[PDB]
Amino acid sequence: ELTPDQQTLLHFIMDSYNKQRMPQEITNKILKEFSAEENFLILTEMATNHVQVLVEFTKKLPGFQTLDHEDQIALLKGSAVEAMFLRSAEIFNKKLPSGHSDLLEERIRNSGISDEYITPMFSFYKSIGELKMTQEEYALLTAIVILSPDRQYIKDREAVEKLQEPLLDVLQKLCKIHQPENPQHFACLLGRLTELRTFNHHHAEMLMSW
């Protein structure tokens, strides 16, 4: 039931959300873990190596470059963490055999990052999993998150809402197509962006490092 405009936007997003791989040596991280203070050195990389993907994905979002310049910065400063939690969640249930559950905890350190990072990311994943959401839903739901016109430091909210709007519009349809049985699927997807905004306090901010 999507319109040309939507199917076009969707494909574009899918495509882009895809050039970020390489699922093979996500096994180097999956099994056989050189653990402990080793494990730090890897994530710190991985993190870092998530920003460059994030920003590549964002530049190619229909209308992004056309935004202001600082607006562009403030978007991304606002999304970096949210969008990493959303990446994790896809992994934690879409990749990986049958969940429960990396369960390293008897190996959690700081960063500073302790045990109040573990628990958050847990409720969240299990709740996203509970949504049994397809990749298209991960892709769009991610652009919805970057293109958020209520980030602090935006000057042209309506410039950003014009861009977010169509993507919300598509996601609604997909929902209303792939699962008409439960007319409250879209509302749950939105609902989760809120647990995202929340974690933005317990992960005070990921500035500086590394």
Binding site: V51, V55, I73, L76, K77, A80, E205, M206, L207, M208
Partner: peptide, 16 residues
């Protein structure tokens, strides 16, 4: 004393 926002400025082209 960077901190983040610079990183993003760079990543927007330079730091590739």
């Amino acid at each position: 004393n960077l901190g983040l926002e610079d990183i993003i400025r760079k990543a927007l082209m330079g730091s590739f």
